[PDB]
């Protein structure tokens, strides 16, 4: 009983099942299989997209570890989407949970990883469409 | 060499023009954004491109020219932006070189980005690389007030 434009924010959680395109993925390490999405998309927009791009996917906050290895896959003007995200008064957190060290360029609440960053890096333009940074986790 | 009877008209060619700093002293002391250290600094009202800062601020006023803020400065400046809002400034890299600005010097800058654009924001402690130099911000400028 209600008219479209109308919205709420949708609720995301890490996914618990596993799945790996073996033939599609960026890189695989770990265990786990991320992708790089082909289509651009604002920093939200990357929780449904990354969700719908492949079963078991969700939209991924890069740790220390996994960040490096992310970034050299990257030329020196692109960038991604990371989901690295935070709630009010609280510290940047992922789907995977944890505590990010977050470089606030900008108070605002997307975040994103480049060639050259060492974290995540907040940014002035959040409806700004870029590559969406994804994972699923392998079968053990 | 150069003695033309005739010059082609080539729609978009171009050239990096030079810039240097102002010789002269002026400030418009009804319109500066705020005024520190016997010189006047201007937030340009309409947004440009990174480059583009260097003639929009020389066109702004006389003896104004796009301005690095220097680590005594860049706290005055970046107070008066609200979270989300950032400036162009001119800090530029000459050649393979070190950080300079107009008024020389050797700046330390966050390269996040491999870029040739820097600004500032309300957070940011000193200049920042940009991945998109088109991206239209106002411009931060300076000009020199009297004696």
Redesign the interface.
Known sequence: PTLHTFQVPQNYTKANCTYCNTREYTFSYKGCCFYFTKKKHTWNGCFQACAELYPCTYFYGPTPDILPVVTRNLN????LWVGVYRVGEGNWTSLDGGTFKVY?????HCTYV????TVP?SH??CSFLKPCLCVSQRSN
């Open positions: 020196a003007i692109e960038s606030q360029i900008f108070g605002s480049s060639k050259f960053s890096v002035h333009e």
